[PDB]
Write a protein that binds this ligand. Structure first.
Ligand SMILES: COc1ccc2c(Oc3cnc(CC(=O)Nc4cc(C)cc(CN(C)C)c4)c(OC)c3)ccnc2c1
Length: 305
């Protein structure tokens, strides 16, 4: 349903937030044409309550085309609606005289790739030592829990007839109480400057996260997002490492992948989590697990761990 966004509704009476009730702060993420800014919103979700929020908007260099793209993103966020594991839309500023602003809840710890890399040294598979009890360490349970939550969020997106197209740990945010939310920086990331995006024709694409059918056939489905989810699992259980370490991402990488070449197990995986990565990476899209099956499986692993 996310291919024809322009026909989706924008109910101003529900979503419109006055620009003067927003106290704009520091940048959280900046692209070439878009940006994400921290802000204090007055009474956006609870009467007369200040709330820290994240605001997506355009910047110098953007054109009317990026403005139309941002409005489509607002419409799809409305269609998607709320779930614990998706960043929740809180409001928007669309009235003339100011920039189009898309306001979502704030996720204090930022993107999951940077977070896990920063916390790599503070990881223990199992907190079992009596002295280690009051140490805020990441454990296997936390990693499986983040994995399970992203699958729940993706299952939810799928139920809304939407697909992600850029699922990766950089598009996962961490909030308080170990809650992770799916986001999509999009224009608020500078893909022409970001090494995760590689020139493949006239577009800069996240090649290391793409299914062979996306690279070779330009096919995007929920099952290609499952492939991306497998790559995300590898990022989680490598504690924020970059995929395919030491591999030049060229025509040869793409052919080897298309032929069945896969990544080796990351350093912090359990045998079952690596098997789950291999299952998401099945060459045949229909043979990959679905998000509903991944939710059930990860929920089982979380209960077994
Ligand atoms: C502390 O540092 C930080 C740093 C960054 C933060 C943050 O960044 C944002 C990231 N992305 C967006 C846009 C977005 O998520 N759009 C979107 C969401 C879904 C579920 C689906 C689709 C549709 N597509 C096709 C899949 C689009 C933001 O909008 C305001 C903010 C949010 C909160 N807190 C943040 C804290």
């Amino acid at each position: 349903l996310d291919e024809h966004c322009e026909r989706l509704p924008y109910d101003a009476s529900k979503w419109e937030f006055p620009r003067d009730r927003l106290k704009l702060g520091k940048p959280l993420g900046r692209g070439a044409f878009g940006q994400v800014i921290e802000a204090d919103a007055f009474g956006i979700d609870k009467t007369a309550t200040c709330r820290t929020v994240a605001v997506k908007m355009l910047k110098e260099g953007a054109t009317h085309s990026e403005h139309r793209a941002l409005m489509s993103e607002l419409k799809i966020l409305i269609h998607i609606g709320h779930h614990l594991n998706v960043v929740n839309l809180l409001g928007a500023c669309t009235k003339p005289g100011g920039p189009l602003m898309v306001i979502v809840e704030f996720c204090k710890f930022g993107n999951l790739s940077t977070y896990l890399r920063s916390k790599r040294n503070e990881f223990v598979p199992y907190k079992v030592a009596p002295e280690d009890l009051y140490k805020d360490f990441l454990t296997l349970e936390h990693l499986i829990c983040y994995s399970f939550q992203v699958a729940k969020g993706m299952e939810f997106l799928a139920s809304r007839k939407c697909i992600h197209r850029d699922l990766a740990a950089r598009n996962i945010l961490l909030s308080e109480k170990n809650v992770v939310k799916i986001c999509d920086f999009g224009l608020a990331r500078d893909i022409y400057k970001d090494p995760d995006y590689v020139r493949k024709g006239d577009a800069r694409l996240p090649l290391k996260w793409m299914a062979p059918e996306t690279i070779f056939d330009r096919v995007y489905t929920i099952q290609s997002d499952v492939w991306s989810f497998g790559v995300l699992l590898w990022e989680i259980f490598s504690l924020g490492a970059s995929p395919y370490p030491g591999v030049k991402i060229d025509e040869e990488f793409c052919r080897r992948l298309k032929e069945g070449t896969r990544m080796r197990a990351p350093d912090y995986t359990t045998p079952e989590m690596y098997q789950t990565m291999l299952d998401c990476w099945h060459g045949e899209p229909s043979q990959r697990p679905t998000f509903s099956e991944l939710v059930e499986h990860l929920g089982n692993l979380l209960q077994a761990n």
